[PDB]
Write a protein that binds this ligand. Structure first.
Ligand SMILES: CCCCCCCCCCCCCCCCCC(=O)OC[C@H](COP(=O)([O-])OCC(O)COP(=O)([O-])OC[C@@H](COC(=O)CCCCCCCCCCCCCCCCC)OC(=O)CCCCCCCCCCCCCCCCC)OC(=O)CCCCCCCCCCCCCCCCC
Ligand code: BCL
Ligand code: BCL
Ligand code: BCL
Ligand SMILES: CC[C@H]1c2cc3[nH]c4c(c3C)C(=O)[C@H](C(=O)OC)c4c3nc(cc4[nH]c(cc(n2)[C@@H]1C)c(C(C)=O)c4C)[C@@H](C)[C@@H]3CCC(=O)OC/C=C(\C)CCC[C@H](C)CCC[C@H](C)CCCC(C)C
Ligand SMILES: CC[C@H]1c2cc3[nH]c4c(c3C)C(=O)[C@H](C(=O)OC)c4c3nc(cc4[nH]c(cc(n2)[C@@H]1C)c(C(C)=O)c4C)[C@@H](C)[C@@H]3CCC(=O)OC/C=C(\C)CCC[C@H](C)CCC[C@H](C)CCCC(C)C
Ligand SMILES: COC1=C(OC)C(=O)C(C/C=C(\C)CC/C=C(\C)CC/C=C(\C)CC/C=C(\C)CC/C=C(\C)CC/C=C(\C)CC/C=C(\C)CC/C=C(\C)CC/C=C(\C)CCC=C(C)C)=C(C)C1=O
Ligand SMILES: COC(C)(C)C/C=C/C(C)=C/C=C/C(C)=C/C=C/C(C)=C/C=C\C=C(C)\C=C\C=C(/C)CC/C=C(\C)CCC=C(C)C
Ligand SMILES: COC1=C(OC)C(=O)C(C/C=C(/C)CCC=C(C)C)=C(C)C1=O
Ligand SMILES: CCCCCCCCCCCC[N+](C)(C)[O-]
Ligand SMILES: CCCCCCCCCCCC[N+](C)(C)[O-]
Ligand SMILES: CCCCCCCCCCCC[N+](C)(C)[O-]
Ligand SMILES: CCCCCCCCCCCC[N+](C)(C)[O-]
Ligand SMILES: CCCCCCCCCCCC[N+](C)(C)[O-]
Ligand SMILES: [Fe+3]
Lengths: 281, 240, 302
């Protein structure tokens, strides 16, 4: 149940709530108050999904889908069977995600490490919350949120995007995508660089961080450095999500039409708007 | 259908990849152990991989993993419960004993070397011709602990030469001796360096280095461990 | 408050680092570029040096030729008016030959021929760049992980512009060179193939792209969290595990019940990222060659 080096780390303390009440492990897993909170929120949500599945009349995981209230409910409560289940499950999900983060905080405290991980995870939570809370509230109905189903969540992405033409034309979406793609590029490069130094040509000595700098300077003329690359990975992945959130929060609140039309502001700048030729004249 | 065969083949590949990846990740820390150090009965479904050998540069030897595992240090902790899964309490001063968040690992008692075989980390005075290039120069600043008392003064920066970065501050105490403070654990301000992890009385307790012009991996671990340990173990006098 | 190690507090600088020698031909290496204090807040301040050599010259020349072939076509489309050039920049497009020309290299210059020429230049640019990722590692005695990972990206690129059009029997299937038009092409590709959301390989591709962001956020945050114990010195933590690596490991073990090593996390990383374009390429390759309509295929499971 313990890694060879683990024992010296398994000390009391670090908890945020309840002192030593929940200060223990189950196998590898640390508990803590928020470990218990996670369990409660998660088990509740799952029971409610199963209830919704019964009301839907299916146990097929590829068919089960829990929908938000119809638009006519606005931001009000709804019958369990007509959106209420979705609403309570959303609360459970939020409670579970936030509890997971807070449990991570407890783990950081015990290990005496920085809080970077739960801080990063909070970006993911905030993106989820953009889609099920901030946006629907700003738009004035829970029904603008996505449904909880494997395929139906994708229908919602497809229907929501196409409400505005090709959703590619959303400028914040473009930046988000760039961050996602660049992040994967940098993840591949980071993994490869470290590995190529730790596993050199057959029979050679391990290369050093100096060789990692040299390879990359040789290749592209720059090396961000070992601290830099981990900051970058974090920045890229968090920016990707930040701009994801941004791109959705502006959609249906301050921008309403086909996203393609937004770009016309540049085209119609008065100094060139009326010149004949090109694509737009 | 070829797309069917493709997707079925991929899932088989993927399970194989995950198996490979998980076993690659068991080269340290396994086999799993009961809380008394004996091999655990349940080792999980993944077996240890075949050993690999790293050839270390600069005649430093080799590393073979997986291999026989031991802490190579005493651990001043004791069970708080008969059943598994509960904390082990410090039997002494956890900070002085290097346990919990003050833990350190029995790393090599030699300094990390760069690609050319020179010490990676040097005090700036011995690093030609390194200098502060931007931000507040902390040399000369008083160092304040979390009790808001002065514990010393910055007399140098220890730099990572190959990476051109500040790694430690060398801090002189009242008695004229110095300690390394990890750069990640200090706040450089305009009139002081503030150290949140340690109260003024805890600086003398920071592990010391054998030679004044180099730091070994073991020393770094003891120092970094001790300083990080203060966030949990000095929390009494802070209050700030 | 506590320092977070996102930005450095104090920069230090020394003599320019000219780097390791090994089997590198030092004559093909440039001098150092300038130092950027601005970059230095976040990563290394030093720019250069860079390795030139014959392959690199070829790659750079080729790449520039690709870029200028497109640009000259844009200028043409703009009627050589610079204001129109700037106005309509993202709307210009160098398009492949029409389907009636098939795979033929006799497509007229202004109807696909220039696209073929641009594509030839990009082909050599990228493949010579790949050789360079291999050779730069080789001259340093390093593993070839970069060249192998780069091959996964090249796979999708090859499928999009080369392999799929050849199997489909016309260049008209390839992607045009244009900012907006490459987007229109992407949208249209899904529409015509019955919605790529029903392509299980597109789903996998997305799992790994999202996963890459998940995993890099995890790894990045982890290393920064243990940088107070020198955790970013990953190679030395591999050679001689420290408390950084141990605390990193245990954070994850206690959180989610399993963990990596300092070396192995970088294997999770490289695979997570390369699987993006590997599955992606497969998904695109089967589209139209084997599966006309992904919705339909899904209804059959095969
Ligand atoms: C169609 C797709 C088109 C393909 C396009 C692109 C593909 C990209 C390839 C991915 C490579 C990236 C990974 C890098 C890596 O680790 O390998 C480096 C590896 C060695 O690294 P090195 O830098 O030379 O040396 C450094 C160290 O000494 C040694 O370095 P090391 O220790 O870091 O690496 C050791 C490496 C060993 O080296 C290799 O062999 C690497 C390579 C290849 C890849 C497998 C590709 C799979 C494609 C997916 C297929 C899906 C089906 C649909 O270990 C593995 O990667 C292991 C394999 C895991 C596969 C598990 C499998 C599935 C089997 C099934 C399970 C069955 C039942 C379960 C139920 O590279 C190679 O030499 C292989 C290239 C072979 C070229 C053949 C030339 C032909 C003539
Ligand atoms: C036809 C469809 C439209 C379109 C529709 C829209 C719509 C609509 C949306 C996007 C959004 C996304 N689109 Mg788009 N977009 C399309 C074209 C694309 C293309 C492409 C190559 O063509 C790409 C790359 C993208 C990519 C982008 C991303 C920027 C973004 C999704 C990531 C995200 O929000 O993360 C955020 C991360 C999360 C939400 C996950 C958080 C989950 C956390 C908190 C916890 C859950 C864990 C728990 C349940 C697990 C159980 C425990 C188990 C034990 C594991 N789109 C086309 C044009 N796009 C979305 C977006 O920006 O969202 C904000 C969005 O709503
Ligand atoms: C992010 C922007 C859009 C989005 C658009 C897309 C698109 C487009 C696709 C997916 C796909 C996925 N989405 Mg989605 N989806 C979003 C909302 C989310 C949320 C959430 C916010 O809580 C969740 C849990 C999921 C999860 C799912 C997975 C079923 C699938 C692969 C994800 C993945 O590997 O991620 C990366 C993370 C990991 C690798 C970690 C593993 C975690 C996964 C495996 C957990 C899945 C849990 C799921 C079965 C629910 C379990 C809940 C239980 C009741 C406890 N999506 C929003 C609305 N999503 C793909 C798919 O194939 O769907 C069929 C796909 O093509
Ligand atoms: C309306 C749009 C369609 C769409 C149809 C498309 C199509 C078409 C494709 C994708 C593809 C993908 N889609 Mg989709 N997709 C849909 C909506 C989604 C959504 C969503 C709804 O949120 C998401 C998240 C995704 C996301 C994804 C990615 C997982 C995947 C691309 C991975 C990649 O790294 O490519 C980026 C990486 C590359 C293209 C490789 C680059 C290669 C190198 C060699 C290039 C060198 C460049 C160099 C010459 C220039 C240098 C200049 C510099 C100055 C140096 N899609 C909808 C249904 N999608 C791709 C895929 O694989 O699908 C299976 C694809 O072909
Ligand atoms: C911000 C950068 C990226 C990121 C970061 C990130 N994610 C993280 C973390 C961080 C650093 C971790 O600390 C944490 C983790 O422990 O990972 C191993 C995590 C995590 N990200 C996860 C998933 C995830 N992250 C996502 C992506 C991202 N995470 C971003 C791209 C996605 C996408 C892109 O779809 C998914 C699916 C988990 C593996 C883990 C969070 C685990 C957790 O919160 O557990 C507690 C809750 C449960 C055990 C289950 C709750 C059940 C609910 C009550 C019911 C289900 C409701 C749900 C809304 C239904 C959805 C149905 C779908 C079909 C739509
Ligand atoms: C695993 C999949 C992910 C991935 C992996 C990946 N990409 C990679 C690598 C790998 C590991 C390489 O090693 C290789 C690399 O060297 O990266 C630094 C690369 C690479 N991926 C790149 C981009 C890229 N990758 C893509 C993404 C991805 N790459 C996937 C997400 C994409 C996307 C998402 O659309 C892009 C655009 C390049 C930076 C690089 C390939 C370099 C190359 O083939 O260059 C050929 C062209 C030239 C040599 C010059 C081009 C000319 C320019 C268009 C304009 C002129 C500017 C010029 C550079 C200045 C010169 C002027 C002087 C004379 C003054
Ligand atoms: C250098 O450092 C590094 C390491 O270390 C040396 C690492 O390990 C890691 C960690 C990374 C890996 C191990 C690689 C693999 C990680 C991914 C591909 C990310 C995706 C992860 C998953 C899909 C697994 C998710 C599993 C979860 C969320 C756990 C599920 C557990 C439950 C049963 C949920 C219920 C709640 C619990 C367990 C609370 C406990 C309380 C009771 C039992 C009551 C990183 C990042 C790192 O950089
Ligand atoms: C200021 O003006 C100047 C002229 C000075 C500079 C301006 C330049 C400008 C504005 C250029 C802008 C370039 C743009 C917008 C490029 C955009 C490119 C994009 C978006 C590419 C997207 C996808 C590209 C793909 C998938 C290409 C694939 C290519 C291949 C796989 C090559 C296949 C090879 C072929 C067809 C040739 C076959 C021949 C042999 C011998 C094998
Ligand atoms: C393998 O790790 C990597 C580094 O090397 C150790 C890098 O350096 C970079 C490149 C970083 C940047 C910010 C390029 C911009 C540089 C200038 C001149 C403005 C990437 C992507 C990388 O993944
Ligand atoms: C709200 C969605 C319903 C939750 C479904 C439970 C997750 C099961 C995993 C889906 C994959 C189905 N499977 C394993 C049979 O292939
Ligand atoms: C997303 C990839 C799936 C990762 C989950 C499978 C790996 C967890 C299994 C590790 C078991 C831990 N153990 C028993 C070896 O200590
Ligand atoms: C993908 C990373 C791209 C980094 C940008 C390239 C920077 C070129 C620096 C080389 C300059 C050296 N110099 C001045 C001697 O030519
Ligand atoms: C490197 C390990 C990462 C494992 C991620 C696996 C996630 C599975 C996503 C389900 C995709 C389902 N489908 C139908 C699109 O294939
Ligand atoms: C693709 C999602 C899969 C979710 C399964 C959860 C993986 C965690 C495995 C941890 C191993 C637990 N163990 C063996 C130590 O008991
Ligand atoms: Fe790393």
């Amino acid at each position: 149940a313990l890694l060879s080096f683990e024992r010296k780390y398994r000390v009391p303390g670090g908890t945020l709530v309840g002192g030593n009440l929940f200060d223990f492990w189950v196998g590898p897993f640390y508990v803590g108050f928020f470990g218990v909170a996670t369990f409660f929120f998660a088990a509740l949500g799952i029971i409610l999904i199963a209830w919704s599945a019964v009301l839907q009349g299916t146990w097929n995981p590829q068919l089960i889908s829990v929908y938000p209230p119809a638009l006519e409910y606005g931001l009000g409560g709804a019958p369990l069977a007509k959106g209420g289940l979705w609403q309570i499950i959303t609360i459970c999900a939020t409670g579970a995600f936030v509890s997971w983060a807070l449990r991570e905080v407890e783990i950081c405290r015990k290990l005496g490490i920085g809080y970077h991980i739960p801080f990063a995870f909070a970006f993911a939570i905030l993106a989820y919350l953009t889609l099920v809370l901030f946006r629907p509230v700003m738009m004035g109905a829970w029904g603008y949120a996505f449904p909880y189903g494997i395929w139906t969540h994708l229908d919602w992405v497809s229907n929501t995007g196409y409400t505005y033409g090709n959703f590619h034309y959303n400028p914040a979406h473009m930046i988000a995508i760039s961050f996602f793609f660049t992040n994967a590029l940098a993840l591949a490069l980071h993994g490869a660089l470290v590995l190529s130094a730790a596993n050199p040509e057959k029979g050679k000595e391990m290369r050093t961080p100096d060789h990692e700098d040299t390879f990359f300077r040789d290749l592209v003329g720059y090396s961000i450095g070992t601290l830099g690359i981990h900051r970058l990975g974090l920045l890229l992945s968090l920016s990707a999500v930040f701009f994801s959130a941004l791109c959705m929060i502006i959609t249906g609140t301050i921008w309403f039409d086909q996203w393609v039309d937004w770009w016309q502001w540049w085209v119609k700048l008065p100094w060139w708007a009326n010149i004949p030729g090109g694509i737009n004249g | 259908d070829l797309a069917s065969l493709a997707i079925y083949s991929f899932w088989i590949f993927l399970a194989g990849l995950i198996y490979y990846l998980q076993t690659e990740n068991m080269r340290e820390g396994y086999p799993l152990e009961n809380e008394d150090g004996t091999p655990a009965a349940n080792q999980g479904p993944f077996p240890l991989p075949k050993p690999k050998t790293f050839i270390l540069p600069h005649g430093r030897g080799t590393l073979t993993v997986p291999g026989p595992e031991s802490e190579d240090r005493p651990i001043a902790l004791a069970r708080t419960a008969v059943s598994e899964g509960f904390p082990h309490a410090p039997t002494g001063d956890p900070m002085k004993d290097g346990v919990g968040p003050a833990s350190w690992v029995a790393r090599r008692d030699l300094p990390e070397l760069d690609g050319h075989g020179h010490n990676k980390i040097k005090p700036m005075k011995a690093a030609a011709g390194f200098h502060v290039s931007a931000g507040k120069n902390p040399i000369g600043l008083p160092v304040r602990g979390c009790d808001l008392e002065i514990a010393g003064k910055v007399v140098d920066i220890w730099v990572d030469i190959p990476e051109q970065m500040a790694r430690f501050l060398e801090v002189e105490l009242k008695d004229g001796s110095t300690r390394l403070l990890p750069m990640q654990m200090v706040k450089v301000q305009s009139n002081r360096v503030h150290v949140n992890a340690l109260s003024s009385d805890l600086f003398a307790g920071i592990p010391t280095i054998k030679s004044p012009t180099e730091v070994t991996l073991l020393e770094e671990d003891k120092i970094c461990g001790y300083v990080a340990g203060g966030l949990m173990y000095a929390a009494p006098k802070r209050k700030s | 408050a506590e320092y977070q190690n996102i930005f450095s507090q104090v920069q230090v600088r020394g003599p320019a680092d000219l780097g390791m020698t090994e089997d590198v031909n030092l004559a093909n290496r440039s001098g150092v570029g300038p130092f950027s204090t601005l970059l230095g807040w976040f990563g290394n301040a030093q720019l250069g040096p860079i390795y030139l050599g014959s392959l690199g010259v070829l790659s750079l020349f080729s790449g520039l030729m690709w870029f200028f072939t497109i640009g000259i076509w844009f200028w043409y489309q703009a009627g050589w008016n610079p204001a129109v050039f700037l106005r309509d920049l993202f709307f210009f497009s160098l398009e492949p030959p029409a389907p009636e020309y098939g795979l033929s290299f006799a497509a007229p210059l202004k109807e696909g021929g220039l696209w073929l020429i641009a594509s030839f230049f990009m082909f050599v640019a990228v493949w010579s760049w790949w050789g360079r990722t291999y050779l730069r590692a080789q001259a340093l005695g390093m593993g070839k992980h970069t060249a192998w990972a780069f091959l996964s990206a090249i796979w999708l690129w090859m499928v999009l512009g080369f392999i799929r059009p050849i199997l489909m029997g016309s260049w008209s299937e390839a992607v045009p060179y244009g900012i907006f038009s490459h987007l229109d092409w992407t949208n249209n590709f899904s529409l015509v193939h019955g919605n790529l959301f029903y392509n299980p390989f597109h789903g996998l591709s997305i799992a790994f792209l999202y996963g890459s962001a998940l995993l890099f956020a995890m790894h990045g945050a982890t290393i920064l969290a243990v940088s107070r114990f020198g955790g970013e010195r990953e190679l030395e933590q591999i050679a001689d595990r420290g408390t950084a690596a141990e605390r990193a490991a245990l954070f994850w073990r206690w959180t989610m019940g399993f963990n990596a090593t300092m070396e192995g996390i970088h294997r999770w990383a490289i695979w997570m990222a390369v699987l993006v374009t590997l599955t992606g390429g497969i998904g695109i390759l089967l589209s139209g060659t084997v599966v006309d309509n992904w919705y339909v295929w899904g209804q059959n499971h095969g």
